[PDB]
Amino acid sequence: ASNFTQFVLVDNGGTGDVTVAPSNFANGVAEWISSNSRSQAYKVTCSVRQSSAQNRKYTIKVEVPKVATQTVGGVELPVAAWRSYLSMKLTIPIFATNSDCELIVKAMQGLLKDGNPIPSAIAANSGIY
Amino acid sequence: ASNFTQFVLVDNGGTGDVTVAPSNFANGVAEWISSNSRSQAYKVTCSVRQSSAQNRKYTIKVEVPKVATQTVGGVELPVAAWRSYLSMKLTIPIFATNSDCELIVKAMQGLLKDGNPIPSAIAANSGIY
Amino acid sequence: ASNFTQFVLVDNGGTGDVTVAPSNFANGVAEWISSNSRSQAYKVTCSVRQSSAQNRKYTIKVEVPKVATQTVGGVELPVAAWRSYLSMKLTIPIFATNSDCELIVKAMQGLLKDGNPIPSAIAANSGIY
Amino acid sequence: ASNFTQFVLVDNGGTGDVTVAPSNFANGVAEWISSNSRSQAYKVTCSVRQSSAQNRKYTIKVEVPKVATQTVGGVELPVAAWRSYLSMKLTIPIFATNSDCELIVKAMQGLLKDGNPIPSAIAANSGIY
Amino acid sequence: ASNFTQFVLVDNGGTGDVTVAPSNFANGVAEWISSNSRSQAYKVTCSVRQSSAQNRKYTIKVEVPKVATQTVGGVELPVAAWRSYLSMKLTIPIFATNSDCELIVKAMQGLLKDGNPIPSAIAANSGIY
Amino acid sequence: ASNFTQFVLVDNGGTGDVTVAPSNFANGVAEWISSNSRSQAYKVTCSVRQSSAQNRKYTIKVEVPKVATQTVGGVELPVAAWRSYLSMKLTIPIFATNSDCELIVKAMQGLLKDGNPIPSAIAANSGIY
RNA sequence: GUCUAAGAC
RNA sequence: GUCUAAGAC
């Protein structure tokens, strides 16, 4: 059994599909990277630690690169023009049962479901109004 | 036009559906709260600010309460035994077009899609392995 | 659903009713204005926030114009002589359930009901006696 | 006659009706309370004062209690779990006619009428949107 | 209804039309932007505040960008060569009727109508003479 | 050719149009006034200068009289209660070609076009909502 | 503006 | 009043 495997990060039907694969798991930090130049790859990292007596804290991080070619002195390199950085911290008390957790996951999914306020605002360079 | 409206945070088919509604929008912070006792409600807040010359930063926060009744001195009150706290920060360079943004949203959705590593780990009081 | 719709403030059985419609929503402070010059209009504003860690607080303000010997569309000074100001503040503990709130609303309705000492005193330029 | 009479504050259709009665006028503040122990009674107070040289100001307060029985020192006492507080201040110019004042009363009644936005929001534990 | 809707800012007869849409209302400032990267978008903002005791003041701003692609560090980024800035402040007395306000709108429209002196001068890079 | 000619500021389809004609040109500041007492007239002024080394700046000012309950030719005080003031400032970089300027004009026309959120809000003594 | 509410900060 | 523009001098 293992959940440290590759998965589809960006789903574009069956074409542009961005897949991210296990890269490293040093120091309690699982890391996934998409293929090709590390310089233009997507990155996802995750780690759980016992943040206190009653809480466990998850720290998920995602990097979305803007793929581009950099030319300097006539030498070109695959780079990322810039990167968008996602960073989330989820705290869960140790009293939470598996059902409680499933619910927390559903809340996260609903928050980002297509059509709801937050994803729509983000997807359009907008805020709330 | 408005995206500051109510939406379904937790989708339980058509039954246990947790809906969250606009509560307040003071100081650039949009806030949504589910119904009934504020003390046991779900809360979602969001805000975007220009974090620097080239970046806009979104700050989404979600609270999932563990509903319970507190009895003290024979007086009972609707409370939350505890709360799970989600907190995310998303940074997006001003060069990102609407397409770039749609992609960032899809990455967030894929990250939490059912069956993928992170949501499965969370939903089971587990980490990565 | 969406409660920021126009409603009837002063009801005179259809003929000569005073309808007030949404006119502003800056900072989450909902505002309703009648179809008049801002100086002679009926204004209603409402907003909610968590005043303390234990209570939420609704703040409602109403402005009613003096109609006797009024000159529609004219410049009437001093403004203090032609306008009445109503300022309501409802503090509700966070333990109040939807039902508890329905009761609180019913109480406010009874307070101002036709025939009761309070409204009948105001309508007669009187106090209690 | 005398307008300092008892009236029904919460109408639950003849049964469960919270009625309130005159209970004090000391210091120019008319008070009404329900038939309970002072510790868990509904309370309504009213006072008018000539605030400015050209204004009169009514100050009205209502207290809605959440009745509970509490065990203090092994002994049960009738008490209030919490109280909701309505506080209104109405400023009317002296130039206002009785007809002008009736308008103010009708506006306050329409404001709280069943189905209109504000009472709807309050009863649903939400804001206006 | 809601007047916070998208509208076409630059009409190039159905094709090449710059349309602008709601994108933010944080802090009482309504914002609209075109569908570009924040770095090269058209932007329109509006806010009303009760400046004096007898005035209301609208503050409107429009930003027209000269889109260009710039090579920074050997990488191409969508940027604006320069921006043109329109800034208008309108002060209306509270005694103004809706009919009085329509007059203000009609005057602003006539001011900028095709062929009239001012737009003619601006479009020709000249002064009035 | 010579743009300092009289034009129509407020158009009501011929019947009751408000034409404004040149009335002053001191210091290159072109001025247009309607056929009224300077206190009740419609005034328009315009001037251009190089605000900085990079931009030129048009400064337009419009004054619109309050007509409701107005007394043609009378002395109406306070002046602040009977006049609305519009103050436009257009900053245009020195790189803007005639075309670039034609676009900027088109944008201003769209902003104030009939039916769009901005003019329709002003004409209704409203803000955005 | 707040609250523990005709009196408190 | 200026600008590099809801925030700067």
PDB file of C-alpha atoms (C1' of nucleotides) in Angstrom, chain H:
ATOM      1  C1'   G H   1      -0.994  70.399  -7.757  1.00  0.00           C
ATOM      2  C1'   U H   2       2.072  66.074  -9.570  1.00  0.00           C
ATOM      3  C1'   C H   3       2.634  60.815 -10.258  1.00  0.00           C
ATOM      4  C1'   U H   4       4.948  55.298 -11.499  1.00  0.00           C
ATOM      5  C1'   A H   5      -2.451  56.108  -9.712  1.00  0.00           C
ATOM      6  C1'   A H   6      -8.138  53.600  -4.533  1.00  0.00           C
ATOM      7  C1'   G H   7      -1.866  55.165  -2.972  1.00  0.00           C
ATOM      8  C1'   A H   8       2.134  57.524  -2.960  1.00  0.00           C
ATOM      9  C1'   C H   9       4.849  63.298  -2.364  1.00  0.00           C
TER      10        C H   9
END
